[PDB]
Symmetry: C6
Subunit: 189 residues, 6 copies
């Protein structure tokens, strides 16, 4: 029975955060995890199996899908959320070690928040560069195996576009909350 | 061993709710989650794989399925339940922070309930606009790849219609309970 | 460490039940859940994929399967068990609130038992009306896309019939136990 | 912290059992559950999908598989283990209620053991009648859709035969242990 | 809160084991379980589906796969690890009963270790007899349905061979540790 | 309630580690496990099913896939992480036994760290030898069943290349941290 230690650890890390920014950030994080784990994962299930091209050339479908999707959106979002979460976990464990020292910091919190913001904007920029924020039903593919130009058709482009916009909005809200947090720490300083 | 704290937290949030409205709302929520997680998820498993169109045009099936189902009903319902649940979690965590302040509100509960009602009615209206409340076995598809008009056939339209009506009834009951809750808070005020 | 509270809650709800009826009902419920979760779910896995019709008409298989199975037996049974379980959960939570009042009913138990009986008989009648209690290997399908009449063949009809009879027997036993419970409460009154 | 109550409940039920019969029976039960849950379930995964018949008749494969396998071996074994386990759970819960009476039997144990033996021998006899204890690679099918007689080929007959023999040996060992238990209770009486 | 009892039970069983043999055996067991549960299970996923034969004879692929693989390697390894684990569980539960007697053995440990060694060597010999320790890409199949001799091709033979060698090395290390354990008990005696 | 013992065990093992090296290593390990368990596993799902070759020769696809992928990257990475983790678990359990002795070492930590470094560099060298650090969309296959030379096409080569580079970077960071740890222990000595 050591429920008090976890409560004290939770209090210490939030002691340097805004009133209510912590709760909105945590709720938004669990919202994003729930959305990623159930809906978008099942939406992207048949990304290659339902992918089809109008050609008889063997191997054209493989290269055309590879060119159309350099990386799946779901795996990209998983990487983004992991990269966003890593600095927070680092800071939490560092504060845990600080408490262990106390039994026998603010600058690190600022660095973690700022790095999380950097990672979020970097992932957004990469998504804009590679894919944009929409998916087209018809993709024109010009790859070496395929003769001339071929037409290929994605799986559920519209629902994927909807989920892409949802994830973009979620990322933007998270970034805005992080900037507000940084501004509050600047105000305190 | 800190079972008392969770009980006190549960008591505090329900202190502003009707006698018995809380239990009906919670039971209905777990009912909806159980129905969504087991039955309707398996019902929508072959939505695109069993989807078929009477044509020889390559890529016509993809675009016709995309036009017929801009977003899957199951994923739409997952989004709806998440959006309905978010304000409740926000209020619960806010009350937790209020208790933390007490160790060392009603307006937020009203706002959360009202926003949950807004989200429920908005999702119902969106479902009515895009899909309606029934599914037809035969869908006439007129999309660019397909020549003229083609006939396509959905997977298990009748069982999906039954589950759609079930979810509509569940959403209506939840909205009615929320309005009764709001009326009770108005009566108290 | 609050094991005593759950024991007291368990005692209070069973205080109004017969000697031994509670244990048989609980064992039968867990039996039905185990049977539904493992065996019958896997038995119905290929209900549409292995479903086949003797025709060349595009879309005839879809409409014929839809007409043959308006709702899957497994999902129907899931709905039935959820509907049967809901009144019990309502009564348990109501008794929990009654204990909370005591810290600072029989009619509801009767109503819950009677409503559970009503739901059980209603689901049995619906199953009898739509399907009966057997499955035939060959189904004659007369639907609009299909020309004239077509012959279709179900997946594992015999094993499904066996499981249907098993579920019917389980439901009948549960209903009989519920009627015995109601008779005992009448005897007490 | 109520670890003592579960220990006392465990002691009370085993108080009427042989020295060491309890441990062998429990180990054998967990062995059977582990074998059923991992190996044989995956072995029977493609029972119908890999099932093939040498014919061009539509629907012949469905009826031939249905006739060859009235019920899957894995589901049959799941039913058998559930039926064997039910009397033990009934007796355990009855002893729990007896302890509740004590805070404020042997004949039932004998009945449960004997009924478990009956169920085991009944399931063995049913398996012998329907299937035997071996699987043949080639099955001759004479069903109405199929013209004359057709040849069908099972999926992995040899490995399935091996697992069938394993389950038969496990069931025989369990029955022998149950008979030894009954003989010991007779010796005590 | 009864953490002390499990620690005492752990101490009692290891009291008859070598210094460090216990930890190496436990680590090796968890290593084998982790390797079996994740890597080799996914490696053997398409053992029959990707299995192909150069023939037009219906049913030749089924019988050729059955003859090539009398039992899957993964299921064989699951059986082997279960058989190896059973004597250890028997001994642990026997020591638990011995402690229960104490509240109100070495020979069994020797027997369990020796039987575990016997089972390990028996499974290794069976694997050598049926399969050997390698898999060939091309299998020549001479079975009744197939005319003359046919050529069949396994799924991922090289990776399966690598995992087979890994499991062989793991089994050999476990057997060597068991023999060292037996020699130590002989030295003590 | 024995939370103190686990804390003491955690303190003892980290007592010989650098300030902050432990936390970075642990965070990196959980990062690698999360990346392997969700993203790369789903990325490699259709490695053989989507693998295609431009030939009519039966069995050419099987042998060409086998030659192209002697072992899957995901299973190789699972083996690598297991091999890296094993020495750490050995050291932790050894320290646990040392504490048990204390109730009634540095050289082992050095050996475990150095062996973990050896395993990491060995797996990196093996990956470089067999595969390199990139995947090509088109693979030229010259195997016995296939006539002359055939062209085969991998599934999602670009996304797999991205994940391969990610895993390479992760492994390099882990190795660098291990070398820094060894240098610190040398400095202490």
């Amino acid at each position: 029975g050591d429920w008090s230690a976890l409560g004290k650890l939770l209090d210490k890390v939030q002691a340097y955060s805004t009133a209510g920014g912590k709760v909105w950030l945590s709720v938004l994080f669990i919202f994003r995890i729930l959305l990623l784990g159930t809906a978008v994962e099942s939406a992207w299930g048949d990304e290659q199996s339902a992918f089809r091209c109008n050609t008889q050339q063997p191997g054209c479908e493989n290269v055309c899908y590879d060119k159309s999707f350099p990386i799946s959106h779901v795996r990209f979002w998983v990487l983004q959320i992991i990269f966003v979460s890593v600095p927070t976990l680092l800071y939490l464990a560092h504060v845990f070690y600080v408490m262990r020292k106390e039994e026998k910091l603010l600058r690190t919190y600022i660095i973690s928040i700022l790095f999380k913001s950097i990672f979020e904007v970097a992932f957004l920029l990469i998504q804009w560069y590679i894919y944009g924020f929409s998916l087209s039903a018809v993709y024109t593919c010009k790859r070496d195996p395929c003769p001339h130009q071929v037409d290929c058709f994605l799986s559920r482009p519209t629902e994927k576009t909807i989920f892409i916009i949802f994830m973009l909005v979620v990322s933007l809200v998270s970034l805005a909350l992080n900037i507000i947090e940084l501004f509050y720490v600047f105000f305190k300083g």
